[PDB]
Amino acid sequence: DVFLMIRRHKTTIFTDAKESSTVFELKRIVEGILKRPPDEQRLYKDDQLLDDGKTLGECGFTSQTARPQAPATVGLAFRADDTFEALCIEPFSSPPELPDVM
Amino acid sequence: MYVKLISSDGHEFIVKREHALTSGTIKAMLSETNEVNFREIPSHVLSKVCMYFTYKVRYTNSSTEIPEFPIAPEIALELLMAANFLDC
Amino acid sequence: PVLRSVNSREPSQVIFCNRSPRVVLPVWLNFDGEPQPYPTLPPGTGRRIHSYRGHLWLFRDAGTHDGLLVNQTELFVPSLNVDGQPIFANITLPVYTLKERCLQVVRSLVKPENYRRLDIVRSLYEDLEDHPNVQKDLERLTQE
Numbered sequence: 001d002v003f004l005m006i007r008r009h010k011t012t013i014f015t016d017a018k019e020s021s022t023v024f025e026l027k028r029i030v031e032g033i034l035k036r037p038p039d040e041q042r043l044y045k046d047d048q049l050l051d052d053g054k055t056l057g058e059c060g061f062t063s064q065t066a067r068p069q070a071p072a073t074v075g076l077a078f079r080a081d082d083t084f085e086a087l088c089i090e091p092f093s094s095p096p097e098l099p100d101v102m
Numbered sequence: 103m104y105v106k107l108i109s110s111d112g113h114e115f116i117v118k119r120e121h122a123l124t125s126g127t128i129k130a131m132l133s134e135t136n137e138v139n140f141r142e143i144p145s146h147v148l149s150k151v152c153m154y155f156t157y158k159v160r161y162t163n164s165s166t167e168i169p170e171f172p173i174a175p176e177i178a179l180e181l182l183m184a185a186n187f188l189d190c
Numbered sequence: 191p192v193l194r195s196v197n198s199r200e201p202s203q204v205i206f207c208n209r210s211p212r213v214v215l216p217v218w219l220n221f222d223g224e225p226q227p228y229p230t231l232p233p234g235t236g237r238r239i240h241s242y243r244g245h246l247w248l249f250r251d252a253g254t255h256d257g258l259l260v261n262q263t264e265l266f267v268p269s270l271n272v273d274g275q276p277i278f279a280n281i282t283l284p285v286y287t288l289k290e291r292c293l294q295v296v297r298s299l300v301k302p303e304n305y306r307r308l309d310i311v312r313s314l315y316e317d318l319e320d321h322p323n324v325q326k327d328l329e330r331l332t333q334e
Contacts, residue, residue, distance in 0.1 A: 003156060005149075013116045014152050033104055033116055068160040069153055069171050093111050093144040095176035101304040102175055154288045161285050168283040170211045173295045182292035183310060186317075190288045 002056055002066035006030060008076035010090045016068075019057035023050045030076070042084050044075025106137045107152065113145035121155035125190040142187070147180045154190065191223035192332050193265075196244035202268035203276045207236040210283040213252040217324055218245065225324045231281070238276065241268045248324065249281045255322045256294060259284050265331065293318055 002021075006013040013033055017026060027038035043050040045059050056066075066072035077085040105122045107115040119136070123129045131138050140148060154171065161168045173181060195218065208214045208231040216228040218241075230252045231237060241247070247266040249258040259282045260266040266279045286294070296318060300308065305318045 003160075010113045011116070012113065012149065012152075014118070014121070014156055016156075067169070069157040069169065071153065071156070090113065092113065092146040092149055093109075095146055095174075095180065098175060099308065101301070101307050102178075102299045151288065154291075158285060158288075167209050168285060170283065171286070171288075171291050173292060175295070175299055178292060178295045178299060179308060179310060182289065182296060182314065185287070185289040185292050186311070186314060188288070 002061055002063055003068045003071040004061065004066050005071045005073050006076055007073055007089045008034075008078070009088055014071065017056060017066075019061065019063060020055055022053060022055050023059070024052040026056075026074075027052070036078060040079035040084075042075075042077040042079070044077070044087055047075065047087055050074075104136070105132060107148060108137065108139045109143055109145040109148040110141055111145050113148070115148055115152050117152050117155060121152070121159050124155045124158050125151075125188040127188045127190075140184075143184045144180065147177060147184050150177060150181055151184055151188065151190070158190070193219055193246060193328055194223035195219055195221055195242075195246050197221050198243045198245075200243040200270060202241050202243045202245075203238065203271050204241050204268050204279055205236055205238050205276045206231055206279050206281065208233055208281050210258060210281055212256070212258065212283065214258060214281050215250045215252040215255070217248045217250060219248070219328075223328075225328070243268055243270055247279065248327070249279075250322075250324060254294060254297065255324065256286075257284065257322060257327055258282065264327070289317075297321070 001016055001018050003016050006015065015029060023043055024038060026043065027041045030036065030041055031038060050059050061072050075087050075089060077087055103119045104116050105119045107117060107122065122132065128138060157171055206216060211233050213233060214231040218226045218228055220226050245268060247260065248264060249260050250256065251258065257264065260279050268277050271277065306315050
């Protein structure tokens with residue numbers, strides 16, 4: 001099994017899958033939460049793009065890299081009005097500087 | 103059944119209700135619909151809390167070897183304050 | 191006392207198996223109920239040790255004294271062997287609360303003399319200064 005964060009702008013989804021799970025199957029559950037069609041979904045692996053037929057293991061996602069305590073990030077973009085959006089994942093807030101006592 | 107947790111900087115985290123109810127504080131807040139807004143918890147901290155919920159539910163009552171839960175030094179204090187407020 | 195080994199003199203063979211990322215400190219409660227430290231086990235190692243039936247064992251992190259689980263519980267008492275098969279004491283990391291895990295990490299990064307220079311509530315200073323120790327947990331176990 002694999003654990004991933006499906007990120008899209010300021011939207012992050014925590015869910016679990018398997019190395020054998022295919023990209024299209026992941027788009028199925030994305031519709032289960034975001035209620036959007038797989039036709040208008042574009043998954044990414046570090047701005048590499050993912051094919052609907054390939055598996056997570058083939059895309060580089062592995063159980064040792066997709067942990068419950070450290071899920072693997074997957075890009076997402078949606079096709080609005082028959083035009084796919086460009087990858088835009090909002091970065092999380094940066095932590096503050098480390099106090100001298102650390 | 104999913105629940106959305108929203109941080110102070112606007113980031114939205116959608117997690118299973120089971121995982122969210124790990125926190126006693128969130129359970130009382132949950133009972134908008136299936137939405138909770140945290141005013142003091144930034145995104146980089148709330149993201150790590152959701153990882154704990156996934157880690158907690160995963161390895162609780164399991165015979166699989168339990169790995170260490172990682173906490174970077176930068177986010178240690180903020181996670182502690184969020185954890186103390188969330189009771190998780 | 192109550193939590194104390196029994197001088198049974200009945201040999202029992204045990205394999206301490208450290209299935210945790212921590213350096214494990216085996217602690218033997220002697221017949222007076224007083225913890226007695228034993229040699230440590232590096233992470234991912236196992237040793238065949240000689241103990242006796244009715245003897246109480248608990249397991250801790252050698253460096254921080256964080257509590258560890260053995261066979262999914264906290265206290266391990268060897269039982270008489272069967273078919274020449276050893277008793278496995280599987281030492282494992284607990285699923286700590288997020289708060290306790292947070293305190294562990296902070297304690298390792300800040301010297302104890304500098305806990306109160308951190309930007310946190312005063313209640314957390316006491317929590318940080320409340321280091322895990324064996325005597326603390328024996329009190330909980332005795333009363334239950």
